[PDB]
Amino acid sequence: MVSLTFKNFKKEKVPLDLEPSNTILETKTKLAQSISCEESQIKLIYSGKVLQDSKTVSECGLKDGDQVVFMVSQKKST
């Protein structure tokens, strides 16, 4: 029951709950279903280190109640 905070570029925090298993795929999906923006443009970063959809949370290096860096794009992406 880890709750992290995803910040964009306007210095806004978007709290999110995940698990050691849950992966970026889901964090990306939610973070997108929270702001209403597709995760196909989003860039889930970690301390200035663009994460990867192939990495979970445990691999991401996140912990319980931390902070994650991310950003949204404008390209709808096919």
């Binding site: 570029f9 200035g48 663009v50 860096v69």
Partner: peptide
Amino acid sequence: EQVDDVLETISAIE
């Protein structure tokens, strides 16, 4: 501060 958030992304993104 926006500048701080910038350099953070630029450099970060490879």
